[PDB]
Design a protein around this ligand. Structure first.
Ligand SMILES: CCCCCCCCCC[C@H](OC(C)=O)[C@H]1CCCC(=O)O1
Ligand SMILES: [Mg+2]
Ligand SMILES: [Mg+2]
Ligand SMILES: [Mg+2]
Length: 124
């Protein structure tokens, strides 16, 4: 369960692709750096700005359907090949997000993934 953090994982090319999305979403949502890093490397915690940040990243990454809900196939296909099997196992019992709004369902997904596989979960 200890987070995996080394030269290959999270993939540096994915981190570099996420950085401009982070910059957009951090300013739109106001989330704190401490909130992101705790959720990534530490414990699940509940923060409304963080939930909105998670929804915003899915929108900025273009992995949402016409209603703004995550399209898990588009998401899976956007990850590096090195992460295809890790992501599949992390997400196979997280198919159907619950929540009344898009921030809540984004948070639901991130909690579900982090509980399923805390070693490979990360957030930036
Ligand atoms: C049939 C199975 C469908 C699988 C659907 C895709 C699952 C994606 C799993 C979550 C992604 O994490 C990993 C390790 O792939 C996210 C975490 C936010 C940071 C990130 O880059 O990716
Ligand atoms: Mg570049
Ligand atoms: Mg920042
Ligand atoms: Mg800690």
């Amino acid at each position: 369960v200890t987070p995996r953090r080394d030269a290959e994982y999270p993939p540096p090319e994915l981190l570099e692709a996420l950085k401009p999305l982070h910059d957009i979403c951090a300013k739109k949502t106001g989330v704190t750096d401490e909130a992101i890093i705790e959720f990534s490397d530490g414990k699940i915690h509940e923060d409304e700005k963080l939930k909105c940040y998670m929804n915003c990243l899915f929108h900025e990454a273009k992995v949402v359907d016409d209603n703004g809900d995550v399209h898990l196939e588009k998401l899976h296909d956007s990850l590096p090949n090195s992460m295809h099997d890790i992501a599949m196992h992390m997400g196979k019992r997280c198919l159907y997000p619950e929540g009344e709004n898009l921030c809540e369902k984004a948070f639901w997904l991130h909690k579900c993934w982090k509980q399923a596989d805390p070693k490979h979960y990360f957030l930036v």
